[PDB]
Design a binder for this molecule. Structure first.
Ligand SMILES: CCCCCCCCCCCCCCCCCC(=O)OC[C@H](COP(=O)(O)OCCN)OC(=O)CCCCCCCCCCCCCCCCC
Ligand SMILES: CCCCCCCCCCCCCCCCCC(=O)OC[C@H](COP(=O)(O)OCCN)OC(=O)CCCCCCCCCCCCCCCCC
Ligand SMILES: CCCCCCCCCCCC(=O)OC[C@H](COP(=O)(O)OCC[N+](C)(C)C)OC(=O)CCCCCCCCCCC
Ligand SMILES: CCCCCCCCCCCC(=O)OC[C@H](COP(=O)(O)OCC[N+](C)(C)C)OC(=O)CCCCCCCCCCC
Ligand code: SF4
Ligand code: SF4
Ligand code: SF4
Lengths: 190, 225, 59, 123, 67, 318, 77, 108
């Protein structure tokens, strides 16, 4: 038709008028049958039985200091500056990881040597304010900074938590083969 | 004269003025976790403004990511592909499963039922594995970019999402069984927090609370995306 | 190539309805069993009371 | 939120200067009357007359304001500050924002002439 | 006794408070040595962003702890 | 002299141990209800949990009355252990009015809840202590009234007289609804959480809590269920032993205490089992449950029992 | 730099499991957004508290919390 | 010297010892109410105290056969009408103002 105006084809659906709630006398069970559930706590014992079923099965719990939970290859933990095979630092002072960081953790000083190649005098990540987005891994064209999957590195001072170039080159030294394995397994999806 | 005494009832301060047991007026403070995330995103690009949205409302993080990466897409006049649409749909729905798995089993703890909180956590852990295998970190997946979705699924992930979806029906019916019929659960909650259908609107309420009161409205079916 | 896909036949349907198989007996049956076990208990108890009274007579 | 909080008033904007003067007058009376509560409440070191002379000298700061609507916002901000102070919402470290000159003398060499400014290049 | 039982009055105030509750979750229990995060002991744990408003509240909670 | 000081040594040391191993048992079984390991172990080294946290609990801060209420709460919780019998005629002190004593000490147990709210007072905390007190006395009523309707069949205030009367049939199986309402009144005396609004020196309340847990378990075990009684066992002995000897009295005292301890242990497990499954009460619901609905049933059961003893001859003789 | 966005304003709202969560972003035409506000869903849920929680008991002020679902990354933000 | 009395002498010593080890090892350093709260305890006493009027019958139930029965039945039946007084009058129930009184909106 034409609708009234102030009004559309979104009428109330067929059956949205819900029925009157039935009284005591339009009930299917007897009052004695209802009182057996009332006094003998019929559904209390049901929920008691459920938690007793959970008592007799084998728990989900795992030992932390001797087992680590299931992890992905694309997981992210402490940083590392990689190197080339035949020993070369691989960060070409290209300044992309500093320009993308949503918390401004990177600070790089760049200087050029006689050779014409480019490296960094001072590389720096403040880990009080790195937020683990992995954009710094995504931006570097030469794949020089990564996220090693280590998380067990909690420290006791903040000055330990300021990572300079030397600490991150050490982290790229230690984690290398698992790092290369994770990047090679990640590499089709990037 | 009625004399009401005041008490200092995540992080939340809440003033209660009590005349005996009854609350006569209530006044929630808020702001002790205001950290200025609305002003900071004006100084960051959109690619950098994306993690400011799993910072807020952290329990259901992919949906909060999605609302910004939809407002941006509408303002861009671009179009996420088809695989992108199904992929973001199902991650938003396991995000819904996670948020209700926290919210239901935390209302159950605040009321007092202590088993579903523990049971819920184990189920949640399986979902945080589903996030952990897709983005890097658990609990802060930036995985829906504004242009689309950040990278492709793993090789054998869709099979494990099916393997979880088979058992989850039974493990949900189990936690449901001891709360839905329970007299203490039903008694403590049948007449509490009632909201009329006209005042569900004037208060600006939405979602499960506007749908509590009888009004059929949801943005998934009304204005879909 | 290499990305994950669903199988060509599709997966089997999962259970998303409510599974509540009825496992309680009828309430009048439990009440009949309760009245029976009570009445047998009162039989034994009042029989013991009468026997203890006859022993008190003997003492 | 139907009901307001305790000492609040509906923010409403006068069209005349004399009505505003009456309202700021009643407002200074409210601060000055509630000044003995603040020393008990925020556990300050010092005397009630120093609270009262500060409330006075904070209304000395805006004595010669001409524009009506700037007096209006200044009244609304003062009533919000009274509202926070008379309850326990402010704490004792934000109540002492108001007294930075009283609590401690920072040390020697407050510069006065150009030379004392200039030896530490205007500080 | 202080070694074998360790009851941190947790200051979980943002995102990291749920990850702290994932210790209290059935996977990463730490039920065995004896850390229980469910809640006047001698350690607290600050976990999440400490705003301008809360720094007196944080210090006041830190003050009423045993020495 | 030496004959009885060794006896009270053995009993005090056993009850003091068992109350401490309950604090471990509750952590363990609630761990496996929720699929966690919980505490590492439970053995002879297993007390060193409950010992170690019972030590460290004495290292926190507190902020003449504060001295007295933990003390009287713990000694009220500890003196009620004589009057339970552990076997036939085995009591640490034999008294013909043991239920009157047990009842008077369930009456003495309320005072620490009053005097705990006075210490470090606020207005709202004082009101909360009032609410815990009033629920404690409210369920103490129905506790005492069912003690009456149990000793209606005995007509004696001695406890071994109850259990020897109980030899023919336990009182739990005729009066099964009474078992149900006693179990809930028993987790009502204590603050067990279906019934625990008003919770949600501390070492004494902590110890006396579990001591009241296992002691009201004992009060269930002798009057409703069989106290030390399991079966007749007249025939097995005539095949094993030839004559009364200290081995024979050992074996019978052993099986009697086993039959008592199995009642107490299953009931004690059921307390922790009803802890986990249910949320807690509004206080209005608590008082409403005690008075308006359960206690009219209690008057009704009270009227229907002597009339049933009346219809038959069946009055019990002292 | 980043990508650049056409100038304009939008309010895009979706259904978070907490409720309707919208975001209102205003684009300069540059690569930084000029202004962008979230509509946290729990903001109006906690704002609706003392219209709903009047005349209830005090433990009736606790069950009413967990279904207005306050996580407080939302309500302050 | 029987075996009953060392126990109730020896327990206050156990409490004093567990208290003195606490004094050795520790660290140191009106609102209006509702009528239901006062009434639960005030009214608890006449229901605790009929119980002790019921205590002498339960011991001597055999002697007073057929006659002390009816006296106790009448005693309880006089108490039940005061019980039904308090449950007819809704005495323990605590009320609040959460209803909007459900008055229909009247115009002009
Ligand atoms: C606090 C004091 C209140 C006294 C409570 C009395 C406790 C009690 O019931 O004592 C009963 C018991 C003997 O009673 P009975 O049942 O006749 O024993 C039968 C023996 N086959 O009696 C006993 O065996 C010993 C009595 C213990 C009570 C000690 C009170 C001594 C008071 C000394 C005053 C010092 C000041
Ligand atoms: C023979 C003729 C007569 C036939 C009928 C039989 C009568 C004899 C039986 C008497 C035994 C009565 C048992 C206690 C009665 C409990 C009353 C009840 O459950 O419901 C009333 C009350 C709520 O009151 P209302 O406003 O009416 O609520 C309506 C909701 N349906 O509910 C409540 O407030 C609380 C409900 C839960 C009570 C606390 C639960 C304690 C949990 C313990 C459960 C048992 C655990 C057993 C453990 C060992 C099991 C192996
Ligand atoms: C092992 C497979 C998983 C099993 C999971 C559930 C098992 C739970 C069994 C517990 C009992 C139950 O819950 O019974 C619930 C019943 C429900 O009866 P109904 O079904 O509605 O009647 C329909 C009958 N039909 C289905 C045959 C057609 O309550 C009642 O009426 C009466 C209350 C009985 C409570 C007994 C408690 C005893 C306390 C006194 C000592
Ligand atoms: C209200 C009840 C009305 C229904 C009555 C129907 C009962 C059947 C009749 C059998 C009588 C009989 O034969 O049993 C007799 C027994 C005692 O046996 P005795 O020691 O050997 O007697 C000695 C033999 N002389 C006398 C020859 C020497 O007495 C009873 O305890 C039976 C009572 C049945 C339980 C009734 C309780 C009902 C529940 C009430 C709680 C709400
Ligand atoms: S992971 Fe993120 S915050 Fe950290 S350095 Fe990389 S881009 Fe910056
Ligand atoms: S790590 Fe990458 S982005 Fe950073 S300076 Fe090196 S090459 Fe450039
Ligand atoms: S450290 Fe802050 S930003 Fe990071 S997850 Fe924790 S709460 Fe959120």
């Amino acid at each position: 038709n034409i609708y009234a105006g102030g009004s559309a084809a979104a009428a109330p659906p067929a059956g949205f008028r819900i029925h009157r709630p039935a009284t005591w006398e339009e009930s299917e069970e007897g009052a004695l049958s209802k009182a057996t559930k009332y006094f003998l706590l019929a559904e209390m014992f049901r929920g008691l039985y459920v938690v007793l079923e959970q008592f007799f099965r084998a728990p989900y719990t795992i030992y932390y200091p001797f087992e680590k939970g299931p992890v992905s290859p694309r997981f992210r933990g402490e940083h590392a500056l990689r190197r080339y095979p035949s020993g070369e630092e691989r960060c070409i002072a290209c300044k992309l990881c500093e320009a993308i960081c949503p918390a401004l953790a990177i600070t790089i000083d760049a200087e050029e040597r006689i050779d014409g190649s480019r490296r960094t005098t001072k590389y720096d990540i403040d880990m009080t304010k790195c937020i683990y987005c992995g954009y710094c891994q995504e931006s570097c064209p030469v794949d020089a900074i990564v996220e090693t999957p280590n998380v067990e590195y909690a420290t006791e001072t903040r000055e330990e938590l300021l990572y300079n170039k030397e600490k991150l080159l050490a982290n790229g030294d230690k984690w290398e083969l698992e790092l290369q394995y994770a990047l090679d397994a990640d590499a089709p999806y990037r | 004269r009625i004399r009401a005494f005041t008490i200092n009832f995540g992080v939340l301060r809440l003033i209660l003025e009590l005349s005996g047991e009854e609350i006569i007026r209530s006044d929630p403070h808020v702001g002790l976790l205001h950290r200025g995330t609305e002003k900071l995103i004006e100084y960051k690009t959109y690619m950098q403004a994306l993690p400011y949205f799993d910072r807020l409302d952290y329990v259901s993080m992919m949906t909060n990511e999605q609302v910004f990466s939809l407002a941006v897409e509408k303002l861009l006049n671009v179009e996420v592909p088809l695989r992108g649409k199904y992929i973001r749909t199902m991650f938003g729905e396991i995000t819904r499963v996670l948020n209700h798995l926290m919210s239901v089993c935390s209302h159950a703890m605040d009321v007092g039922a202590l088993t579903p909180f523990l049971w819920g956590f184990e189920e949640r852990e399986k979902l945080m594995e589903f996030y952990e295998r897709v983005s890097g970190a658990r609990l802060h997946a930036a995985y829906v970019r504004p242009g689309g979705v950040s990278q492709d699924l793993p090789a054998g992930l869709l099979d494990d999402i099916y393997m979880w979806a088979t058992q989850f029906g039974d493990r949900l019916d189990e936690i449901e069984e001891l709360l839905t019929d329970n007299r203490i659960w039903k008694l403590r909650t049948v007449n509490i927090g009632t909201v009329t259908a006209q005042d569900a609107l004037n208060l600006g309420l939405s979602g499960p609370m506007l749908r509590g009161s009888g009004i059929p409205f949801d943005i998934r079916k009304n204005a879909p995306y | 190539v290499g990305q994950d896909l669903p199988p060509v036949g599709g997966y089997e349907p999962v259970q998303w309805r409510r599974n509540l198989p009825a496992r309680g007996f009828r309430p009048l049956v439990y009440l009949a069993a309760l009245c029976g076990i009570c009445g047998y208990g009162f039989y034994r108890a009042l029989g013991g009371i009468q026997e203890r009274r006859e022993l008190k007579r003997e003492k | 939120a139907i009901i307001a909080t305790a000492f609040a008033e509906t923010v409403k904007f006068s069209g005349s200067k004399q009505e505003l003067q009456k309202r700021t007058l009643a407002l200074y009376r409210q601060f000055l009357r509630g000044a003995p509560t603040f020393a008990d409440l925020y556990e300050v070191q010092f005397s009630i007359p120093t609270i009262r002379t500060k409330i006075r000298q904070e209304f000395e700061r805006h004595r010669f304001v001409d524009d009506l609507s700037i007096q209006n916002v200044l009244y609304a901000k003062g009533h919000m500050e009274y509202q926070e102070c008379i309850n326990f919402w402010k704490q004792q470290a934000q109540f002492l924002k108001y007294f930075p000159e009283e609590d401690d003398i920072q040390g020697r060499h407050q510069p006065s002439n150009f030379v004392d400014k200039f030896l530490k290049n205007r500080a | 006794a202080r070694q074998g039982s360790f009851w941190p009055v947790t200051f979980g105030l943002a995102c990291c408070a749920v990850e702290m509750m994932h210790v209290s979750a059935p996977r990463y229990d730490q039920d065995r040595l004896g850390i229980i995060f469910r809640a006047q002991s001698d350690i607290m744990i600050v976990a999440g962003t400490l705003t301008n408003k809360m720094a007196p509240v944080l210090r006041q909670v830190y003050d009423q702890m045993p020495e | 002299m030496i004959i009885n000081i060794v006896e009270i040594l053995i009993f005090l040391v056993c009850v003091l141990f068992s109350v401490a191993y309950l604090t471990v048992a509750e952590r363990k079984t609630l761990a496996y209800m929720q699929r966690r390991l919980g505490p590492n172990f439970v053995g002879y080294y297993g007390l060193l949990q409950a010992f170690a946290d019972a030590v460290k609990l004495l290292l926190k801060e507190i902020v003449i009355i504060l001295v007295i209420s933990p003390l009287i709460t713990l000694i009220t919780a500890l003196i009620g252990w004589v009057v339970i019998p552990l076997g036939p005629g085995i009591t640490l002190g034999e008294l013909n009015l043991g239920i009157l004593f047990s009842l008077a000490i369930g009456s003495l147990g309320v005072f620490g809840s009053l005097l705990s709210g006075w210490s470090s007072n606020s207005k709202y905390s004082l009101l909360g202590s009032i609410r815990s007190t009033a629920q404690l006395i409210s369920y103490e009523l129905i506790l005492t009234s069912i003690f009456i309707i149990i000793i209606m069949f005995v007509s004696s205030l001695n406890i071994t007289t109850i259990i020897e009367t109980q030899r023919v049939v336990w009182y739990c199986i005729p009066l099964l609804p009474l078992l149900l309402i006693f179990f809930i009144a028993s987790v009502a005396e204590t603050a067990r959480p279906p019934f625990d609004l008003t919770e949600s020196p501390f070492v004494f309340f902590f110890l006396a809590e579990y001591s009241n847990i296992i002691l009201i378990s004992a009060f269930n075990g002798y009057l409703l269920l069989g106290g030390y009684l399991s079966f007749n066992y007249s025939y097995l002995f005539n095949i094993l032993f030839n004559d009364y000897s200290y081995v024979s009295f050992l074996f019978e005292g052993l099986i009697n205490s086993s039959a008592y301890a199995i009642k107490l242990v299953f009931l004690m497990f059921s307390f922790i089992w009803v802890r986990a499954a249910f949320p807690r009460f509004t206080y209005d619901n608590l008082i409403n449950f005690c008075w308006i609905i359960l206690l009219p049933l209690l008057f009704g059961i009270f009227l229907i029992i002597p009339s049933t003893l009346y219809i038959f001859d069946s009055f019990p003789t002292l | 730099k980043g990508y650049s966005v056409p100038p304009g304003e939008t309010y895009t709202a979706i259904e978070a499991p907490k409720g309707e969560m919208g975001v209102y972003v205003v684009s300069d035409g540059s690569e930084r957004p000029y202004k962008c506000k979230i509509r946290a869903p729990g903001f109006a849920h906690l704002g609706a508290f003392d219209h709903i929680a009047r005349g209830h008991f005090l433990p009736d002020a606790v069950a009413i919390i967990g279904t207005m679902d306050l996580v407080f990354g939302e309500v302050d933000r | 010297m029987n075996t009953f009395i060392i126990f109730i002498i020896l327990i206050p010593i156990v409490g004093f010892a567990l208290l003195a080890v606490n004094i050795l090892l520790a660290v140191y350093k009106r609102l209006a109410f509702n009528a239901a709260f006062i009434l639960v305890a005030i009214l608890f006493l006449p229901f605790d105290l009929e119980i002790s009027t019921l205590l002498p019958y339960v011991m001597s139930i055999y002697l007073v056969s057929n006659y002390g029965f009816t006296i106790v039945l009448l005693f309880l039946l006089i108490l039940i009408i005061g019980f039904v007084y308090e449950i007819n009058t809704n005495a323990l129930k605590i009320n609040k103002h959460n209803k909007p009184n459900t008055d229909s909106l009247i115009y002009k």
